[PDB]
């Protein structure tokens, strides 16, 4: 109890300091979120962590525990006896997550004896050696090659969480604790895994396959009026489609699906807005609406399967929305600055100075307005961290909630190999 | 007598043949103005259908100015009727920010005692 | 004497055809200098509805160019409405939103606090 009066001192600080201009919403609304954040952190208000083995005993036969007590081979044969080897471009597909199912029996049966400094092994083996294959695959087989690793990695992580129900409601100071400790652990040190191999294969893979589709040209080009770029949007969408198969193809997880597409927007996101301060090339408020429409038909082959699609390309179609209404009143943009809630200043100082009217020195943008935000540029600048960042940069949340076990499907689509085999036999 | 009575019928239809060829003359000359009057009575009414269609192509764009330079009339207010009507959502937002700081106040205040 | 007669008679059947000849080359004169008056009446009235008509071709250049013109500012004011209510709703869209989520917040940890303090 007596803890309830560090509380009220460290916070008798953040509040002197909390209640320098009439800094506008989108600043507001910052402000607050981190009061709440802060205070939230001083409602719960550590030293020395160490692995450890525990007792066998139950369903382990005299000769299950030996094949265990064997880690220099089941691994071997995992890694290099046929994870590394297998083809993608022909797997049965009878067995798809095959990968997974194999990877976690052992994971299961070795944890069911107590023999965790010998998984954890396993595992981080293991792990290493996916995401090198993920580092290596094709320009080619970077397609469905990623994924069919991919679903297959975001199942490990949950059939973690899952072998935790198992362990959990006992009570038992050694078969639990060290246990539900290396498995709540594991669902970490595996999950960044999966997320920092699938961010680093999404970003690659949408490079490679935004050239192959030539997407600027097609949304973000002057040279294109015509429905030929409804020619190549239909490349575009038979492309997407094709992309849509491959996830099927590879039983992957459903809410996982969905994640891969609002990513897939928001790198189209960035680049779409990047290139629009950079090729572009002059914007003008026609320009804008013949790019809009353009972004229309881009996320009309969303609507149908994901949820609530344009707030991925909010800094883009917001972006745009700006062009399309040239204004020449400061006090005007001043009004309406609220309204662009995704670019921060610096940006919107980008998109608006790279425009010139082909109306013939006609519709010119102001001074009087150019100015404003070199000032409110400067002034937001200081006040933070150190310059506000122009260009747009592609990153990707986590896969926490995304991911999920379902023992169901993996075995209807698993079969197997060697060693295993025969460790799975002894199990139960 | 009977050779200057002749003489007097020798003149005069030597003369009529004179007179008479004159007047073939002339009529020829009429005929190709009635002609030319006739050209020229034609092209004042080819100008006077070019004029009657110049007549409808500046009844189309007369009735134009007008729906045209009204419907970007009527446009000025129900854009402006959009700006001042912004005036009144920034408050509504900057108030209901306000709001919900209180309720962070107040909370704030919660633990501090 | 009876050939006298025959010749007087038919001098004078030429005296009636003399002045019948000319009684018909003044009225064929009548005429083309008529058609003259109204030939040149209407080389005339030809250059007056040709000069109008060249005003009809100034003034429907000159409106043509209005009507062509306006129809730009229309699209340009269109697109700008447009542009602007489109965010507005985007705008309240997402604050309206935002505000929700975050009083939700506060209400969520005051409930956790008032419920360590009662316990």
Known sequence: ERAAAQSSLIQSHMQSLAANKPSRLSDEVKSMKQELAFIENVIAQANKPKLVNVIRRESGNPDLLELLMDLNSYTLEVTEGYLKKVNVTEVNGDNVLGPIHVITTVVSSLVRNGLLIQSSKFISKVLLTVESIVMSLPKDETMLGGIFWLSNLSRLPAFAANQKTLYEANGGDEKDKLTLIYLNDLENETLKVFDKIYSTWLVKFMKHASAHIEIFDMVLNEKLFKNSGDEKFAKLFTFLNEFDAVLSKFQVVDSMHTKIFNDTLKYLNVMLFNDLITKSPALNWKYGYEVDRNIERLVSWFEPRIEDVRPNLIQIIQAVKILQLKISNLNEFKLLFDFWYALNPAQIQAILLKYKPANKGEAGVPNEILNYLANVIKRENLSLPGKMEIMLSAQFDSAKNHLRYDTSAITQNSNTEGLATVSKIIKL | ?113
């Open chain 2, 1 to 113: 007598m009977e050779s200057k009575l002749l003489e007097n019928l020798n003149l005069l239809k030597n003369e009529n043949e004179n007179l008479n060829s004159i007047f073939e003359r002339k009529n020829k000359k009429l005929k190709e103005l009635e002609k030319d009057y006739s050209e020229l009575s034609n092209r004042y009414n080819e100008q006077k259908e070019k004029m009657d269609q110049l007549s409808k192509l500046a009844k189309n764009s007369s009735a134009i100015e007008q729906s045209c330079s009204e419907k970007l009339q009527n446009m000025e207010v129900n854009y402006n009727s959009l700006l001042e009507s912004q005036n009144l959502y920034r408050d509504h937002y900057s108030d209901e920010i306000s709001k919900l700081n209180e309720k962070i106040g107040l909370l704030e205040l919660e633990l501090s005692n």
